[PDB]
Short mmCIF file of C-alpha atoms and ligand atoms in Angstrom, two decimals:
data_model
loop_
_atom_site.label_atom_id
_atom_site.label_comp_id
_atom_site.label_asym_id
_atom_site.label_seq_id
_atom_site.Cartn_x
_atom_site.Cartn_y
_atom_site.Cartn_z
CA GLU A 4 229.53 16.70 -78.49
CA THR A 5 229.74 14.17 -81.34
CA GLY A 6 232.57 12.40 -83.29
CA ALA A 7 235.62 10.71 -82.12
CA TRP A 8 239.36 11.16 -81.49
CA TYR A 9 241.84 8.40 -81.14
CA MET A 10 245.18 9.71 -79.72
CA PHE A 11 246.57 6.25 -79.54
CA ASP A 12 248.88 7.22 -76.47
CA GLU A 13 248.17 4.43 -73.99
CA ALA A 14 246.11 1.30 -73.85
CA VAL A 15 243.07 1.33 -71.52
CA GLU A 16 243.57 -0.25 -68.10
CA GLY A 17 242.82 -3.94 -68.26
CA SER A 18 244.08 -4.49 -71.73
CA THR A 19 247.10 -4.37 -73.91
CA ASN A 20 245.44 -3.19 -77.16
CA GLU A 21 242.46 -1.01 -76.63
CA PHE A 22 242.50 2.72 -77.21
CA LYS A 23 239.67 5.05 -76.11
CA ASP A 24 237.85 7.73 -77.98
CA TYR A 25 238.82 10.95 -76.17
CA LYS A 26 235.52 12.48 -77.15
CA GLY A 27 233.67 9.76 -75.15
CA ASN A 28 231.19 9.03 -77.91
CA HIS A 29 232.40 5.71 -79.31
CA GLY A 30 233.94 2.45 -78.13
CA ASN A 31 237.52 1.51 -77.95
CA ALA A 32 239.71 1.21 -81.12
CA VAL A 33 241.42 -2.19 -81.12
CA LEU A 34 245.04 -2.53 -82.35
CA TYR A 35 246.41 -5.72 -83.94
CA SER A 36 250.15 -5.18 -84.12
CA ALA A 37 253.10 -6.89 -82.32
CA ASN A 38 254.73 -3.45 -82.19
CA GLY A 39 252.12 -1.89 -79.86
CA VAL A 40 252.14 1.98 -79.71
CA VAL A 41 255.48 3.79 -79.82
CA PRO A 42 256.91 7.30 -79.63
CA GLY A 43 255.51 9.24 -82.57
CA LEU A 44 254.05 12.66 -83.47
CA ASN A 45 251.91 13.43 -80.32
CA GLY A 46 253.04 11.25 -77.47
CA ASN A 47 252.56 7.79 -78.95
CA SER A 48 251.42 6.60 -82.23
CA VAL A 49 250.30 3.32 -83.90
CA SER A 50 253.01 1.54 -85.88
CA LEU A 51 251.76 -0.97 -88.53
CA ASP A 52 254.21 -3.43 -90.07
CA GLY A 53 252.64 -3.29 -93.53
CA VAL A 54 252.22 -7.11 -93.35
CA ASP A 55 249.18 -7.88 -91.26
CA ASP A 56 248.74 -5.05 -88.71
CA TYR A 57 245.64 -2.81 -88.51
CA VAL A 58 243.16 -1.05 -86.27
CA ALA A 59 239.57 -2.06 -85.79
CA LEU A 60 237.31 0.79 -85.07
CA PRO A 61 233.96 0.24 -83.40
CA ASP A 62 230.96 -0.41 -85.60
CA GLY A 63 228.79 2.58 -86.58
CA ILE A 64 231.38 5.23 -86.07
CA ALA A 65 230.86 6.90 -89.42
CA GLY A 66 227.54 5.59 -90.99
CA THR A 67 225.04 7.94 -89.41
CA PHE A 68 226.20 11.23 -90.94
CA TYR A 69 225.25 13.07 -94.01
CA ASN A 70 228.28 15.42 -94.13
CA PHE A 71 231.51 14.54 -92.39
CA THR A 72 235.30 14.84 -91.94
CA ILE A 73 237.81 12.18 -91.40
CA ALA A 74 241.27 13.48 -90.45
CA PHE A 75 244.46 12.10 -89.14
CA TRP A 76 248.20 12.28 -89.20
CA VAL A 77 250.17 9.73 -91.12
CA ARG A 78 253.75 8.66 -91.77
CA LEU A 79 253.87 6.43 -94.83
CA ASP A 80 256.82 4.00 -94.74
CA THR A 81 256.17 2.24 -98.11
CA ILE A 82 255.06 3.90 -101.32
CA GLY A 83 252.48 1.60 -102.98
CA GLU A 84 248.88 0.45 -103.23
CA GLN A 85 247.60 0.24 -99.57
CA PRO A 86 244.29 0.86 -97.70
CA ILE A 87 244.52 3.70 -95.30
CA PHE A 88 240.93 3.49 -93.93
CA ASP A 89 237.78 1.58 -94.95
CA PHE A 90 234.24 2.03 -93.61
CA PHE A 91 232.01 -0.52 -95.15
CA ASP A 92 228.42 -2.05 -94.88
CA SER A 93 228.47 -5.04 -92.62
CA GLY A 94 225.62 -6.52 -94.85
CA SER A 95 227.36 -6.51 -98.26
CA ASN A 96 230.71 -6.08 -99.78
CA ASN A 97 229.90 -3.35 -102.39
CA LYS A 98 228.79 -0.44 -100.24
CA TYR A 99 231.72 1.33 -98.71
CA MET A 100 234.01 4.32 -98.59
CA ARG A 101 237.78 3.89 -98.45
CA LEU A 102 240.88 6.09 -98.55
CA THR A 103 243.89 4.58 -100.18
CA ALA A 104 247.60 5.24 -100.83
CA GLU A 105 248.41 4.92 -104.53
CA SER A 106 251.32 3.61 -106.67
CA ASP A 107 253.22 6.84 -106.25
CA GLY A 108 252.49 8.68 -102.92
CA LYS A 109 249.18 10.06 -104.19
CA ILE A 110 246.04 9.19 -102.19
CA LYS A 111 242.62 8.34 -103.34
CA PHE A 112 239.28 8.49 -101.72
CA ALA A 113 236.47 6.33 -103.13
CA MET A 114 232.75 5.93 -102.19
CA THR A 115 230.59 3.36 -103.86
CA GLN A 116 227.20 1.88 -103.75
CA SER A 117 227.89 -0.70 -106.54
CA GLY A 118 231.15 -2.34 -105.72
CA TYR A 119 234.63 -1.79 -106.95
CA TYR A 120 233.63 -0.87 -110.48
CA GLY A 121 231.30 1.75 -109.43
CA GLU A 122 233.69 3.75 -107.22
CA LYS A 123 233.35 7.55 -107.40
CA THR A 124 236.74 8.93 -106.45
CA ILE A 125 238.95 11.84 -105.63
CA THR A 126 242.63 11.54 -106.33
CA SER A 127 245.47 13.84 -105.24
CA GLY A 128 247.81 15.63 -107.77
CA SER A 129 250.94 14.26 -109.54
CA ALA A 130 254.46 15.72 -108.69
CA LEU A 131 257.96 15.10 -110.32
CA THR A 132 259.53 11.77 -109.23
CA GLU A 133 263.25 11.08 -109.17
CA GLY A 134 264.53 9.40 -112.29
CA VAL A 135 261.12 9.26 -113.91
CA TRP A 136 260.46 11.07 -117.29
CA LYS A 137 257.38 13.28 -117.09
CA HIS A 138 255.80 15.96 -119.34
CA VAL A 139 255.48 19.40 -118.01
CA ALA A 140 253.60 22.43 -119.44
CA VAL A 141 252.67 25.96 -118.34
CA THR A 142 249.90 27.85 -120.16
CA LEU A 143 248.93 31.54 -119.84
CA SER A 144 245.54 32.51 -121.08
CA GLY A 145 244.46 35.98 -120.19
CA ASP A 146 244.71 36.30 -116.41
CA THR A 147 244.78 32.50 -115.92
CA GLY A 148 247.97 30.52 -115.76
CA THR A 149 248.03 26.66 -115.60
CA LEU A 150 250.57 24.00 -114.64
CA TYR A 151 250.32 20.58 -116.11
CA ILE A 152 252.10 17.29 -115.35
CA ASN A 153 251.67 14.55 -117.95
CA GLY A 154 248.65 16.48 -119.24
CA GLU A 155 246.96 16.84 -115.85
CA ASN A 156 246.07 20.22 -114.35
CA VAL A 157 247.96 20.62 -111.11
CA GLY A 158 247.59 24.33 -110.22
CA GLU A 159 246.12 27.66 -111.48
CA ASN A 160 246.29 31.28 -110.63
CA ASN A 161 243.47 33.30 -112.12
CA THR A 162 245.10 36.68 -111.12
CA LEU A 163 247.95 36.85 -113.60
CA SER A 164 247.79 40.18 -115.43
CA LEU A 165 251.51 40.70 -115.72
CA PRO A 167 256.91 41.75 -117.65
CA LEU A 168 258.95 40.97 -120.77
CA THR A 169 256.11 41.66 -123.21
CA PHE A 170 256.63 43.91 -125.05
CA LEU A 171 260.40 44.97 -125.42
CA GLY A 172 260.83 41.20 -125.12
CA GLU A 173 262.62 41.14 -128.47
CA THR A 174 266.01 41.08 -126.52
CA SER A 175 264.77 38.73 -123.65
CA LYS A 176 267.27 36.03 -122.51
CA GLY A 177 266.35 32.38 -121.85
CA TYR A 178 267.87 29.40 -120.16
CA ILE A 179 266.92 25.80 -119.40
CA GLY A 180 268.52 24.74 -116.23
CA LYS A 181 269.99 27.93 -115.07
CA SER A 182 268.51 31.04 -113.58
CA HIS A 183 269.88 34.66 -114.02
CA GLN A 184 270.74 36.66 -110.93
CA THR A 185 267.69 38.34 -109.38
CA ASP A 186 267.70 41.43 -107.13
CA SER A 187 267.79 39.15 -103.92
CA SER A 188 270.40 37.14 -102.15
CA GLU A 189 267.59 35.07 -100.63
CA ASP A 190 266.83 33.64 -104.07
CA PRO A 191 267.70 30.10 -103.68
CA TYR A 192 267.61 29.37 -107.44
CA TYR A 193 270.48 31.75 -108.40
CA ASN A 194 273.43 29.54 -108.80
CA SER A 195 271.45 26.33 -108.64
CA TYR A 196 271.66 24.07 -111.69
CA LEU A 197 269.14 21.56 -112.87
CA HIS A 198 270.25 17.88 -112.41
CA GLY A 199 268.37 15.90 -115.06
CA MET A 200 267.37 15.32 -118.67
CA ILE A 201 265.21 17.46 -120.94
CA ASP A 202 263.69 16.75 -124.40
CA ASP A 203 261.16 18.30 -126.84
CA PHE A 204 261.32 21.74 -125.54
CA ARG A 205 258.41 23.66 -127.11
CA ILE A 206 256.92 27.06 -127.16
CA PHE A 207 253.69 28.35 -128.46
CA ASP A 208 252.27 31.86 -128.84
CA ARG A 209 248.86 30.80 -127.42
CA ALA A 210 247.48 28.77 -124.64
CA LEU A 211 246.91 25.14 -125.59
CA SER A 212 243.79 23.38 -124.19
CA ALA A 213 243.99 20.49 -121.81
CA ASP A 214 243.57 17.69 -124.31
CA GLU A 215 245.98 19.55 -126.57
CA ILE A 216 248.36 19.33 -123.65
CA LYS A 217 247.45 15.64 -123.25
CA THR A 218 248.35 14.93 -126.89
CA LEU A 219 251.89 16.38 -126.29
CA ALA A 220 252.17 14.24 -123.12
CA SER A 221 251.61 11.12 -125.27
CA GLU B 4 253.76 28.89 -138.24
CA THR B 5 255.15 30.41 -135.05
CA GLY B 6 256.87 29.07 -131.96
CA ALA B 7 259.75 26.65 -131.51
CA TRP B 8 260.63 23.00 -131.01
CA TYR B 9 263.99 21.66 -129.72
CA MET B 10 264.21 17.93 -130.17
CA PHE B 11 267.88 17.98 -129.13
CA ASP B 12 268.61 14.90 -131.26
CA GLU B 13 271.79 15.95 -133.11
CA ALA B 14 274.05 19.00 -133.22
CA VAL B 15 273.96 21.13 -136.30
CA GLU B 16 276.61 20.49 -138.95
CA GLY B 17 279.71 22.60 -138.22
CA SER B 18 279.31 22.52 -134.49
CA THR B 19 279.31 20.38 -131.49
CA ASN B 20 276.75 22.08 -129.31
CA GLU B 21 274.03 23.75 -131.40
CA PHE B 22 270.49 22.43 -131.72
CA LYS B 23 267.99 23.81 -134.27
CA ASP B 24 264.43 24.89 -133.91
CA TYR B 25 262.51 22.26 -135.90
CA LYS B 26 259.76 24.86 -136.48
CA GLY B 27 262.35 27.06 -138.37
CA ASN B 28 261.31 30.23 -136.53
CA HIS B 29 264.21 30.74 -134.05
CA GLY B 30 267.95 30.44 -133.82
CA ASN B 31 269.91 27.54 -132.43
CA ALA B 32 269.71 26.45 -128.82
CA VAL B 33 273.22 26.22 -127.36
CA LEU B 34 274.23 23.43 -124.96
CA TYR B 35 276.86 23.87 -122.26
CA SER B 36 277.56 20.27 -120.99
CA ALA B 37 280.46 17.97 -121.10
CA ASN B 38 277.95 15.16 -121.52
CA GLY B 39 276.57 16.32 -124.95
CA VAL B 40 273.18 14.78 -125.97
CA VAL B 41 272.56 11.09 -125.15
CA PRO B 42 269.88 8.34 -125.66
CA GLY B 43 266.77 9.64 -123.92
CA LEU B 44 262.99 9.83 -124.39
CA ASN B 45 262.72 10.65 -128.13
CA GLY B 46 265.99 9.85 -129.90
CA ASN B 47 268.42 11.85 -127.95
CA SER B 48 267.95 14.23 -124.91
CA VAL B 49 270.01 16.84 -123.12
CA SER B 50 271.70 15.54 -119.92
CA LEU B 51 272.63 18.29 -117.36
CA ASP B 52 275.03 17.50 -114.53
CA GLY B 53 273.30 19.61 -111.95
CA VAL B 54 276.54 21.42 -111.35
CA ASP B 55 277.13 23.98 -114.18
CA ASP B 56 275.36 22.62 -117.27
CA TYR B 57 272.51 24.42 -119.07
CA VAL B 58 270.99 25.44 -122.35
CA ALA B 59 270.97 28.92 -123.78
CA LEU B 60 267.97 29.69 -125.91
CA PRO B 61 268.11 32.46 -128.50
CA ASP B 62 267.04 35.99 -127.38
CA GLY B 63 263.38 36.93 -127.90
CA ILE B 64 262.00 33.42 -128.06
CA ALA B 65 259.18 34.15 -125.56
CA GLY B 66 258.87 37.88 -125.02
CA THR B 67 256.55 38.81 -127.90
CA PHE B 68 253.47 36.96 -126.93
CA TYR B 69 250.42 37.81 -124.81
CA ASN B 70 249.22 34.17 -124.29
CA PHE B 71 251.55 31.23 -124.52
CA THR B 72 252.50 27.69 -123.77
CA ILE B 73 255.88 26.26 -122.66
CA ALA B 74 256.03 22.52 -122.66
CA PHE B 75 258.64 19.97 -122.46
CA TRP B 76 259.59 16.55 -121.15
CA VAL B 77 261.82 16.28 -118.09
CA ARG B 78 263.56 13.53 -116.05
CA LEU B 79 264.52 15.08 -112.68
CA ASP B 80 267.62 13.35 -111.20
CA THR B 81 267.81 15.34 -107.97
CA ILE B 82 264.90 16.52 -105.80
CA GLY B 83 265.63 20.07 -104.60
CA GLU B 84 265.53 23.76 -105.37
CA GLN B 85 266.61 24.19 -109.06
CA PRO B 86 265.73 26.46 -112.09
CA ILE B 87 264.07 24.60 -114.84
CA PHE B 88 263.63 27.56 -117.23
CA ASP B 89 264.10 31.35 -116.95
CA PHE B 90 263.09 33.97 -119.44
CA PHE B 91 264.11 37.39 -118.28
CA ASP B 92 264.54 41.00 -119.39
CA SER B 93 268.00 41.64 -120.70
CA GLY B 94 267.82 45.28 -119.24
CA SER B 95 267.03 44.48 -115.65
CA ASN B 96 267.14 41.64 -113.18
CA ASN B 97 263.57 42.00 -111.77
CA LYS B 98 261.46 41.33 -114.78
CA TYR B 99 261.18 37.66 -115.55
CA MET B 100 259.34 34.35 -115.56
CA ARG B 101 260.85 31.26 -114.29
CA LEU B 102 259.71 27.57 -113.73
CA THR B 103 261.36 25.90 -110.80
CA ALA B 104 261.63 22.49 -109.12
CA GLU B 105 260.91 22.81 -105.40
CA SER B 106 262.18 21.29 -102.15
CA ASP B 107 260.07 18.17 -102.68
CA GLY B 108 259.27 17.40 -106.38
CA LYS B 109 256.64 20.04 -106.59
CA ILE B 110 257.22 22.66 -109.36
CA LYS B 111 256.62 26.38 -109.30
CA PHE B 112 256.00 28.87 -111.96
CA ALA B 113 256.63 32.53 -111.18
CA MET B 114 256.17 35.78 -113.05
CA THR B 115 257.34 39.15 -111.74
CA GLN B 116 257.72 42.68 -112.67
CA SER B 117 259.17 43.75 -109.28
CA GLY B 118 261.96 41.23 -108.56
CA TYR B 119 262.04 38.17 -106.33
CA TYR B 120 259.73 39.59 -103.64
CA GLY B 121 257.04 40.39 -106.08
CA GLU B 122 256.71 36.96 -107.72
CA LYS B 123 253.15 35.90 -108.57
CA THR B 124 253.25 32.15 -108.55
CA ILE B 125 251.61 28.84 -109.24
CA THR B 126 252.74 25.78 -107.30
CA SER B 127 251.93 22.15 -107.82
CA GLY B 128 250.13 19.98 -105.18
CA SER B 129 251.68 18.03 -102.20
CA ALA B 130 251.73 14.24 -102.06
CA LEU B 131 252.70 11.68 -99.30
CA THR B 132 256.48 11.35 -98.94
CA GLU B 133 258.19 8.27 -97.55
CA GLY B 134 259.10 8.52 -93.88
CA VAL B 135 257.58 12.00 -93.55
CA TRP B 136 254.67 12.75 -91.06
CA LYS B 137 251.84 14.56 -92.86
CA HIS B 138 248.20 15.48 -92.05
CA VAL B 139 245.50 14.05 -94.17
CA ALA B 140 241.76 14.96 -94.26
CA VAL B 141 238.73 14.10 -96.34
CA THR B 142 235.56 16.32 -96.14
CA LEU B 143 232.07 15.62 -97.58
CA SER B 144 229.79 18.68 -97.86
CA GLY B 145 226.59 17.98 -99.84
CA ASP B 146 227.78 16.75 -103.23
CA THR B 147 231.40 18.13 -102.87
CA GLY B 148 234.14 16.02 -101.37
CA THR B 149 237.61 17.36 -100.66
CA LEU B 150 241.09 15.95 -100.02
CA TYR B 151 243.56 17.74 -97.86
CA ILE B 152 247.28 17.19 -97.21
CA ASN B 153 248.69 19.33 -94.38
CA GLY B 154 245.64 21.62 -94.74
CA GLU B 155 246.05 22.25 -98.43
CA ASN B 156 243.26 21.27 -100.87
CA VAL B 157 244.61 18.66 -103.32
CA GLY B 158 241.43 17.40 -105.05
CA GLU B 159 237.59 17.77 -105.25
CA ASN B 160 234.70 16.00 -106.82
CA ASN B 161 231.55 18.04 -106.85
CA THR B 162 229.41 15.08 -108.08
CA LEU B 163 229.20 12.96 -104.90
CA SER B 164 225.58 12.29 -104.07
CA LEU B 165 226.12 8.83 -102.58
CA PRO B 167 226.16 4.14 -99.23
CA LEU B 168 226.35 3.26 -95.52
CA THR B 169 224.15 6.14 -94.43
CA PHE B 170 221.49 5.22 -93.16
CA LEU B 171 221.63 1.62 -91.73
CA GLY B 172 225.16 2.62 -91.02
CA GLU B 173 224.66 1.79 -87.35
CA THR B 174 226.38 -1.65 -87.94
CA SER B 175 229.05 -0.35 -90.32
CA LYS B 176 232.58 -1.74 -89.92
CA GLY B 177 235.79 0.34 -89.96
CA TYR B 178 239.49 -0.39 -90.26
CA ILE B 179 242.63 1.73 -90.41
CA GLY B 180 245.26 -0.03 -92.52
CA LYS B 181 243.24 -2.88 -93.82
CA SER B 182 240.48 -3.12 -96.43
CA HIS B 183 237.49 -5.59 -96.38
CA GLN B 184 236.99 -7.92 -99.38
CA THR B 185 235.18 -6.17 -102.23
CA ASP B 186 233.19 -7.95 -105.03
CA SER B 187 236.36 -7.84 -107.39
CA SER B 188 239.50 -9.85 -107.54
CA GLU B 189 241.07 -6.88 -109.48
CA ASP B 190 240.90 -4.85 -106.27
CA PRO B 191 244.55 -4.29 -105.41
CA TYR B 192 243.80 -3.09 -101.91
CA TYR B 193 242.20 -6.29 -100.66
CA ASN B 194 244.90 -8.09 -98.71
CA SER B 195 247.24 -5.07 -98.85
CA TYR B 196 248.25 -3.67 -95.43
CA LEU B 197 249.40 -0.16 -94.64
CA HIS B 198 253.04 0.23 -93.75
CA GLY B 199 253.42 3.32 -91.58
CA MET B 200 252.38 5.21 -88.44
CA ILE B 201 249.07 6.86 -87.70
CA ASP B 202 248.05 9.35 -84.98
CA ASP B 203 245.16 11.55 -83.83
CA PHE B 204 242.50 9.74 -85.82
CA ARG B 205 239.49 12.00 -85.85
CA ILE B 206 236.00 11.96 -87.21
CA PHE B 207 233.42 14.68 -87.33
CA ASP B 208 229.74 14.67 -88.39
CA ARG B 209 230.09 17.80 -90.57
CA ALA B 210 232.55 19.15 -93.09
CA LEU B 211 235.27 21.34 -91.57
CA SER B 212 236.37 24.42 -93.48
CA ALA B 213 239.81 24.79 -94.94
CA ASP B 214 241.30 26.85 -92.07
CA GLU B 215 239.60 24.49 -89.66
CA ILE B 216 241.53 21.82 -91.43
CA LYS B 217 244.72 23.97 -91.32
CA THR B 218 244.31 24.24 -87.45
CA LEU B 219 244.25 20.40 -87.16
CA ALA B 220 247.36 20.25 -89.41
CA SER B 221 249.24 22.46 -86.87
CL1 CL C 301 244.99 7.16 -75.54
CL1 CL C 302 267.90 18.09 -133.43
NA1 NA C 303 249.23 10.10 -80.09
NA1 NA C 304 264.89 14.24 -128.51
#
């Protein structure tokens, strides 16, 4: 085998803060936390105070692979800018890969060979946050439908050939209410939107992404 | 021109609850809310109580188009299952398209010609929620990197040719701490993760999506 697995269930004998690699390929992870490990998802889990707690992994654990996967379970107790993991060159400070929590619950992965300003990144999608004004749009273009939040593409379904059109002349429309469908399992029937709405707009074509962006300005 | 635009700034003369289409192509939107319109994003905005308030749009506004866009601004005051808009056949209850808010701030768009159980949908991406255990994974396969939350793909960057590899033998790794980069604008330096972590795993290849799913079980 290759790779590692930290289950963080119980310190190794002889210590209070060392946790083994269950795959038996790498050294012990070291925990710096006054909490220690506590009941969590699978047996025990690391609990970090968000102040100065972290885990040191042994050197070399990820720098010898061309392709790879890093995976773990996490319970985020504070929404904000925070490092989740960071694997970096011991010889310089501008060669690294780091997964971060973002200003809003999104996550970002960055790899760079030229410091902070050269990061190549991947960022997760936006969602609707409580009490925060956002722009939403749906576009249908042939078989492809697209969802946008603040002018960013957040989903597609390229298999949409479909209902109202034509004989849509007498179609009904609500904002914030649904009509009664054919199913009592519909959870939206009799649910009413709690919020505010503005500039409701409809177009008889599919706007492009930067067209969408411009509305979201 | 074609299409509509409801700015919801001021009731039309002679009424208390009618709002015109600024494009002058469709009838008045009708508001059912004891709140009326109030200061919002652009001038005034509709405020729905989440109990029984909604807006009726005039019949036909969207059922005569092959391709289209629906776009608006929204401020969601309660996270949960709620209809945002619904355009449906006046002759049956199983021919409609509806945009909904979901259990967690995501949004879903559905079109159907065969009732609730036949909905074809588009759903926005997951994010990390406060106090909620989630599975996260990053995979690098050739030039393509992928982010996953609970086994669902939430971002990619097909242009990743890059840093540690090789000479990665002495690379350093943290969970919950970042090293100091070359920039004082780095907001992650000196930030510490507030949360829990379990089953931290590393692989020297890129797992497939259902492989990822299986870890997220
Ligand atoms: Cl263990
Ligand atoms: Cl108006
Ligand atoms: Na564990
Ligand atoms: Na307005």
